[PDB]
């Protein structure tokens, strides 16, 4: 994004944290501006010797080396959890077949088996069921409860 995020004279709107007392945990967001105590003297929010501002601007100029040119980054994290799944691919659904050996896919849960009308008393919230072996034993049709 050098054409957009760089300007003659240096674009400094984009910042990065340069000092921190410890490494960040995954997906932690720190926006604090407390003066970093590099030495033994408490800073009390006052910059100076061994008291530095934790942030610094990026120098994004159109003439900067590609290593230093601005890049826009998007990170997608996917929540493969045991809950109903609401972000799906464009893959179309099909009709359901019972009492046949079939290759089924319910919401990404894939397998091969024979699907039959069950008599299990699923609760209004319970999505699919499991057997003693922690294997999928019963499902809820995403389109039909």
């Amino acid at each position: 994004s050098n054409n957009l995020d760089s300007k003659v004279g240096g674009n400094y709107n984009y910042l990065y944290r340069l000092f921190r007392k410890s490494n960040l945990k995954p997906f932690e967001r720190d926006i604090s501006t407390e003066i970093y105590q590099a030495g033994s003297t408490p800073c009390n929010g006052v910059e100076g010797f061994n008291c530095y501002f934790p942030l610094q601007s990026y120098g994004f100029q159109p003439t900067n080396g590609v290593g230093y040119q601005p890049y826009r980054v998007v990170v997608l994290s996917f929540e493969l959890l045991h809950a109903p799944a609401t972000v799906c691919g464009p893959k179309k659904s099909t009709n359901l077949v019972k009492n046949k050996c079939v290759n089924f896919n319910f919401n990404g849960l894939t397998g091969t088996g024979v699907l039959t009308e069950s008599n299990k008393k699923f609760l209004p919230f319970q999505q699919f069921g499991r057997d003693i072996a922690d294997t999928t034993d019963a499902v809820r049709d995403p389109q039909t409860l």
Partner: nanobody
Framework: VQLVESGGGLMQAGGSLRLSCAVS????????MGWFRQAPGKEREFVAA????????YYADSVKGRFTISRDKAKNTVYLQMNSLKYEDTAVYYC????????????????????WGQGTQVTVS
Amino acid sequence: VQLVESGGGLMQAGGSLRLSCAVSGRTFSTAAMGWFRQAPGKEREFVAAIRWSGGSAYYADSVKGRFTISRDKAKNTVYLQMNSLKYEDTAVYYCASYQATRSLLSDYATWPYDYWGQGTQVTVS
């Protein structure tokens, strides 16, 4: 940004004088303002800078202990309190704006800034 200085004038040695400078536009909280001066026949010289957030101050050795820089956030105005004026303080004083945020405060003494005020003359008799 537009920078407008005021407060220059004639003062006797030993007196005190306050210059003012109003900042408008992209008033970055994580930036800094600096005051510099240029004496006749001499190069422009950095005096002091203050960060908008927190108000930590940095002074040139030539002015340390005599001058004070301050800023009023609500009014978007920065002030340089020029105490114990000496002949060597005679110069055109300019207030300049930085849009670059630096972790090391001392860098604002030497950083090339983005925008400069017009200057106000102080002459010490």
